[PDB]
Amino acid sequence: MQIELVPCLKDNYAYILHDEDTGTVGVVDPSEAEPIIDSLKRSGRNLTYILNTHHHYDHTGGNLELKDRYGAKVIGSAMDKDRIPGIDMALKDGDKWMFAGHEVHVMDTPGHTKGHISLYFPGSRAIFTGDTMFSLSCGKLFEGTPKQMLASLQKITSLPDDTSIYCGHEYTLSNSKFALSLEPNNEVLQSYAAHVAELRSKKLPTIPTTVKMEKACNPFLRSSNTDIRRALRIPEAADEAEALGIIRKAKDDF
């Protein structure tokens, strides 16, 4: 399955999924129709679906337009059944959904919003995390709690290390600044951050990342690290969740 990024807006990533076996094609989080319209016009194919990770306008923007202007079916969470524009299929946690015979796992991943889901294609060793996990950060906790976000991050990190993560936004460079201000002694992070600056210096994406890397560099996945805790006056008595919420608060005000 081909996976084509679609940098909508200023730093949004939508993803066009191509089913090589046939002509099946869908789009993950179409911020707006225009960018998806451009690519499909090129591919020479039409749109069958529209899968949304969460309800925010920057992920459901082009929904109603693409659906009516393609006959595509909108696939997305059941919790946001009335918030996902034009939703045809409301999927639940652990639900399996077939994209042309390609299995998709539907994992609820609350935190950034209540109802957020991530989509894991085991056959492609790929998971679409929307705004739950980015490279070197997690989403802002608009609706969920620090505990809910930690649980959702652990579901994503319970997948194989080779699993590529297609962060929902190009935030990696900024995320690296805050990450290096907390754990400047982890060279895997110093190493990856430099490569991120290079890509961004020539306008290239830093996505997909991978479970392996985020475990080795994302502060929200390394909150028990001693240097990271002391850099944020995180008492030792704090547990996993508690340490994550302290980091999320600082990053927000960094």
Pairing of strands 49-52, 73-77: parallel
Pairing of strands 87-91, 73-77: parallel
Indicate if 116 belongs to the active site. Answer: no
Instruction: Name the strand (E) or helix (H) holding 14.
Output: strand 12-18
For residue 150, give both structure tokens. Answer: 């930690």
Cβ-proximal residue to Zn ion, closest one: 56
Q: Which is nearer to Zn ion, 9 or 100 (CB)?
A: 9
Taking CB under 5 A as the binding criterion, the range among 40-48, 50-58, 186-194, 245-253 that sits at the site for Zn ion is: 50-58
Instruction: Give, as ranges, the residues between 35 and 74 that touch Fe ion (CB under 5 A).
Output: 58
Indicate if 54 belongs to the active site. Answer: yes
Indicate if 59 belongs to the active site. Answer: yes
Given the structure tokens 């579901």, which residue do they identify?
155
CA pair distance 30, 16, nearest whole angstrom: 9
Given the structure tokens 């959702």, which residue do they identify?
152
56 touching Zn ion, by CB under 5 A: yes
User: Does the annotation flag 55 for ligand binding?
Assistant: no
Q: How far is CA 219 from each of CA 69, 142, 179, 194, rounded to the nearest angstrom?
A: 42, 19, 6, 16
- The total number of residues shown for the chain amounts to 254
User: Does the annotation flag 88 for ligand binding?
Assistant: no
Catalytic residue among 29, 55, 59, 80: 59
131 touching Fe ion, by CB under 5 A: yes
CB of 115 to Zn ion, least distance (A): 11
Indicate if 102 belongs to the active site. Answer: no
**Known binding residues for Zn(2+):** 54, 56, 112, 131
**Known binding residues for Fe cation:** 58-59, 131, 169
Binding site for Fe ion (CB under 5 A): 58, 131
